[PDB]
Write an enzyme that holds these catalytic residues in place. Structure first.
Site, PDB file in Angstrom:
ATOM      1  N   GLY A 233       5.529  -6.738  -4.154  1.00 58.24           N
ATOM      2  CA  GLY A 233       4.503  -6.232  -5.192  1.00 58.24           C
ATOM      3  C   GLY A 233       3.119  -6.205  -4.580  1.00 58.24           C
ATOM      4  CG  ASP A 258       4.504  -9.050  -0.395  1.00 53.89           C
ATOM      5  OD1 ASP A 258       4.763  -9.149   0.906  1.00 53.89           O
ATOM      6  OD2 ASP A 258       4.366  -7.735  -0.830  1.00 53.89           O
ATOM      7  CG  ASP A 281      11.715 -12.378   4.458  1.00 52.83           C
ATOM      8  OD1 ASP A 281      12.527 -11.433   4.814  1.00 52.83           O
ATOM      9  OD2 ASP A 281      11.531 -12.926   5.618  1.00 52.83           O
ATOM     10  CG  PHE A 282      12.882  -7.431   0.970  1.00 54.34           C
ATOM     11  CD1 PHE A 282      13.062  -6.797   2.210  1.00 54.34           C
ATOM     12  CD2 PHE A 282      11.869  -7.268   0.264  1.00 54.34           C
ATOM     13  CE1 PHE A 282      11.857  -5.988   2.687  1.00 54.34           C
ATOM     14  CE2 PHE A 282      10.741  -6.400   0.570  1.00 54.34           C
ATOM     15  CZ  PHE A 282      10.930  -5.767   1.796  1.00 54.34           C
ATOM     16  NE  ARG A 298       3.082   1.319  -6.378  1.00 49.42           N
ATOM     17  CZ  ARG A 298       1.930   0.849  -7.002  1.00 49.42           C
ATOM     18  NH1 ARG A 298       1.884   0.901  -8.360  1.00 49.42           N
ATOM     19  NH2 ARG A 298       0.908   0.385  -6.451  1.00 49.42           N
ATOM     20  CG  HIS A 302       7.247   4.417   2.486  1.00 53.22           C
ATOM     21  ND1 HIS A 302       5.976   5.043   2.436  1.00 53.22           N
ATOM     22  CD2 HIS A 302       6.915   3.099   2.001  1.00 53.22           C
ATOM     23  CE1 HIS A 302       5.141   4.435   2.205  1.00 53.22           C
ATOM     24  NE2 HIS A 302       5.629   3.217   1.833  1.00 53.22           N
TER      25      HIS A 302
END
Ligand SMILES: C=CC(C)(C)[C@@]12C=C(O)C(=O)N3/C(=C/c4c[nH]cn4)C(=O)N[C@]31N(OC)c1ccccc12
Ligand SMILES: C=CC(C)(C)[C@@]12C=C(O)C(=O)N3/C(=C/c4c[nH]cn4)C(=O)N[C@]31N(OC)c1ccccc12
Ligand SMILES: Nc1ncnc2c1ncn2[C@@H]1O[C@H](C[C@@H](N)CC[C@H](N)C(=O)O)[C@@H](O)[C@H]1O
Ligand SMILES: Nc1ncnc2c1ncn2[C@@H]1O[C@H](C[C@@H](N)CC[C@H](N)C(=O)O)[C@@H](O)[C@H]1O
Lengths: 394, 394
Positions: A233, A258, A281-282, A298, A302
């Site tokens: 975010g 984040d 941390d994804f 969001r 990309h």
């Protein structure tokens, strides 16, 4: 001569102008901007117009130097003039360099050449001083432009095969850091965190957030289910939008995750507005907060290719969901399959340099199936570049 | 809204168009191209227009990749279409990369997006295949663009002071070759000599050679005096022009000097047309052929700063002159002191990257006095960017 060419193109501009000036709230505006460009190109002629790439390059160079050197901030707003000498004096940029650089940004550039060694701001140069542009433009010109220019060099190393990865790309080539992702390499130097977080905040086209019903979905959720997570975010401007959109609420948890340097910069600003700042941390972890309203991404995906990282994001998040209570919301540009704009092209092809990409509708389709995810519905209010991909567990 | 802004700018375009379409053989054309640009900028608005630098960058990147990857040559001329698939097939550039890249050059770019994964040439893209553009554009994009972009980085190393030299500049920084001049570093790799000599041949704006009386001066010269030297003549296209201009001649020596790799590429082509190919270096040697008609420098001095190299050129040439029989002709752009064009700006600021520069009239004044040289007369047929600086020994 073929002055005829100019006439026809003038006519069309004039025509497209008239249309634009009696429509309402679009295709008209784009078409006119297109016919306006054709004219410039037609006036110059095919051979002289090919030289526009060289002109364009120095202009971006000189704008970047001038903005970094403090020239935009030393010059008086409102169109009052200032000399080469007085400018050089206040910034310590070589008055000889400054004079030469100015030639790239007066003839049409966003500055005005009032007289010999005498320059003025216009609203187009002053636009570079606004939050959106001033947060966005420096980061891009310092860190991204050079890589984008080296796309050709990278793909030539592979005989035009697509070798691009998140850690082997024109970015790692240009900044000489093979193995590091773009974020990793920038956050290593801590002086970069503040500029980069401001750039991440930049929202030039004003993203539409009333696109999907937050009030309805979140407040039809009982107890621990009722909670939204803005993953990556950053600032949290997305969350604040959502919160503003629905105050028709109970005590609802709102979390913005984040990486740590990002959580630092915005943490107590987020606690303030009432949001849980969580470090996450994804890539190295599974998603902590379980069974929530929706997990919201969001302008995240990309940054990533479908695999490896794309699937791992959705897989690390499937961990903490609920077959029918949780939902996933990807909010990103949806590229048309025909008639892309330069707005589409510049974002996508910049990402290309760091191994990211903007996705088609059918591109988002592939991504979902790969992670065994079922498309619920795509939200889009067309005339708007971004939609939301809503999805559930198959 | 401020749709008013568009109207006024349309009006002016329309106005400036009408003027342009009833003048003769200029200010009209430039003004219209300027009012045409204002419109595009006004349509977009100051903030969205600031994003033009990013759009411009990927477009130059993608054009460069496409041209290098052989896409321009694989695609049919005359506007016949070809698919992403058929293109990728003939070039081996990743069809996925190609699709993305194309988005940067269809919406306005010189290509046409006929349909989904279907693209066509237009005369504006085909212009990139002509001698001038095809010789010029690759060299610039491979070797010069990246440096121009790094101007900001170099001057930041010196806190915006002007540290630029011929061997310490954005070029040496970007290509990591401190100490080498631009020519030295390019000619070291022999594969570069042919492209670079073709680029040196590029003459997009068609230089005017009937600007100064060759027939008169050369054939009023007796014997050994009657002889012209095109120093750094490269190809020799300048000499051939001059020779064509005056055939009202006796046996007159015509010599084209330049470095060895240049003399190789063009030698027997020059012997053929009747010209003496001499190897010479105006940095390590004094000028060989003594007491000649005129020593002629075309598009040479803008490669150099006034000192050291600028003075050494003229000093190594003073050696072989005649107080009143020899004369020196510098033929180069003369930058106006106000109202420079982007044509001026892109050439000058590119040179800036290799420690070169385009010179004012008063800039040429300084250069002459520094070498104790007397200005005879400046030849210019205005409406033409290049003049000749004629000079003699004080
Ligand atoms: C420059 C760093 C980032 C801000 C992190 C950015 C990453 C994002 O995820 C993002 O959303 N971005 C922007 C959004 C925006 C939309 N309108 C105005 N700004 C943006 O300019 N730059 C980026 N972006 O996107 C084209 C990048 C391209 C290449 C590298 C990195 C990024
Ligand atoms: C690219 C190599 C060179 C051709 C040697 C070139 C050197 C020259 O002396 C010259 O005359 N040039 C050109 C003339 C031209 C005019 N109209 C179409 N082409 C040109 O593009 N590039 C250059 N140029 O000038 C702006 C350079 C800029 C930076 C580095 C090197 C050069
Ligand atoms: N491994 C990672 N794990 C979690 N977040 C990351 C990771 N890498 C980058 N990010 C964050 O992804 C975000 C990308 C931003 N451009 C998007 C932020 C925000 N969602 C927005 O729409 O503006 C940044 O805030 C990154 O710090
Ligand atoms: N030290 C040097 N000595 C002599 N010639 C040089 C030297 N360095 C570069 N050159 C040549 O200067 C020329 C620059 C060209 N752009 C100009 C060629 C020609 N006069 C023209 O107008 O197109 C090249 O041909 C170089 O090879």
């Amino acid at each position: 001569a073929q002055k005829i060419a100019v006439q026809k193109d003038v006519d069309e501009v004039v025509a497209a102008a008239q249309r634009f000036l009696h429509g309402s709230g679009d295709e008209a505006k784009v078409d006119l901007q297109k016919k306006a460009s054709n004219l410039v190109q037609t006036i110059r002629g095919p051979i002289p117009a090919a030289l526009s790439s060289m002109e364009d390059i120095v202009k971006v160079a000189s704008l970047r130097t001038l903005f970094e050197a403090g020239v935009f901030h030393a010059m008086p707003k409102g169109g009052a003039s200032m000399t080469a000498s007085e400018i050089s004096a206040q910034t310590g940029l070589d008055k000889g360099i400054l004079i030469r650089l100015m030639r790239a940004v007066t003839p049409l550039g966003p500055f005005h050449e009032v007289g010999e060694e005498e320059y003025a701001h216009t609203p187009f140069s002053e636009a570079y001083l606004t939050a959106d542009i001033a947060g966005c433009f420096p980061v891009m010109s310092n860190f991204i432009f050079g890589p984008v220019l080296q796309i050709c060099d990278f793909l030539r190393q592979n005989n035009w095969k697509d070798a691009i990865t998140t850690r082997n790309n024109p970015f790692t080539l240009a900044h000489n850091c093979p193995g590091e992702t773009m974020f990793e390499h920038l956050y290593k130097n801590s002086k970069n965190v503040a500029p980069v977080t401001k750039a991440e905040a930049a929202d030039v086209d004003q993203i539409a957030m009333d696109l999907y019903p937050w009030e309805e979905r979140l407040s039809d959720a009982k107890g621990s289910n009722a909670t939204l997570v803005d993953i990556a975010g950053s600032h949290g401007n997305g969350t604040r939008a959502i919160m503003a959109l629905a105050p028709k609420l109970n005590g609802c948890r709102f979390i913005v995750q984040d990486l740590e340097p990002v959580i630092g910069e915005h943490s107590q600003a987020l606690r303030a507005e009432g949001i849980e700042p969580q470090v996450y941390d994804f890539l190295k972890q599974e998603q902590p907060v379980h069974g929530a309203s929706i997990y919201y991404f969001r302008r995240v995906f990309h940054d990533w290719p479908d695999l490896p990282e794309g699937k791992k994001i959705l897989d690390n998040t499937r961990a903490a969901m609920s077959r029918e209570h949780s939902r996933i919301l990807i909010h990103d540009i949806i590229v048309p399959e025909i008639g892309a704009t330069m707005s589409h092209a510049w974002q996508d092809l910049s990402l290309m340099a760091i191994g990211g990409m903007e996705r088609t509708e059918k591109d988002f389709a592939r991504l979902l199936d790969i992670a065994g995810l079922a498309l619920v519905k795509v939200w889009r209010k067309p005339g708007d570049m971004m939609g939301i991909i809503e999805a559930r567990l198959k």
